[PDB]
């Protein structure tokens, strides 16, 4: 069951350490009301700080799945890419999906669908937290994903994100689009429209 006790998680705040992360996930998890038990759900944190990527390991199958739920938590200011490891396979009998909502996490995983939005031209110093609170000011994000340099770290100045209420999205449009930010200028529109 390892495979089923651990989870990748990536876009990690540079220099963090594996304790930071682990005191982090513990805490959220007894915050969350996700914790099944006295003591720590996450026994170990491996970090590739080259690759800006960690793996956690859990002491159980449960709090495993349970912590999905947290795909998108920003943590110093960067939102948390939270998935299964590519090796993992559904045990027989267990769930493979979180049963509970955190409040007011942002899932990462944003598909491709009618009202998916696409956001060009942001300033590349905003972080993922500033990005989503301008969308957020608009309304409740289903999913949100700004598009880093995977070895850099920098923003490319893009994004993506789903409303919760499909009709938000022509007011974030409405709201955005043609927006001029210095040498910049805001391409606010479904994703569909400019896709390649």
């Given at each position: 069951t390892r495979q089923a006790r651990r989870l990748y998680v990536g876009n990690i705040p540079f220099g963090i350490t594996e304790e930071a992360m682990m005191d982090f996930f513990n805490a959220q998890m007894r915050l969350g009301g996700l914790t099944q038990a006295p003591g720590n759900p996450v026994l170990a944190v491996q970090i590739n700080q080259d690759k800006n990527f960690a793996f956690l390991e859990f002491r159980s199958v449960d709090e495993t799945t349970q912590a999905m739920a947290f795909d998108g938590i920003i943590f110093q200011g960067q939102s948390l890419k939270i998935r299964r490891p590519h090796d993992y396979q559904p045990l027989p009998g267990?769930?493979?999906?979180?049963s509970v909502y955190v409040p007011g996490v942002v899932s990462t995983v944003v598909p491709d669908s009618a009202h998916k939005l696409f956001i060009g031209g942001l300033p590349n110093y905003l972080n993922d937290d500033q990005v989503k609170e301008l969308l957020t000011s608009f309304g409740p994000l289903k999913a949100f994903n700004l598009v880093k340099d995977s070895a850099t770290g920098l923003s490319k100045g893009y994004a993506f994100c789903e409303y919760v209420d499909i009709n938000v999205t022509d007011q974030a449009i409405a709201g955005l689009n043609g927006m001029q930010l210095g040498d910049k200028k805001l391409l606010v529109q479904r994703a569909s429209v400019g896709a390649k």
């Open positions: 267990m769930s493979e999906n979180p």
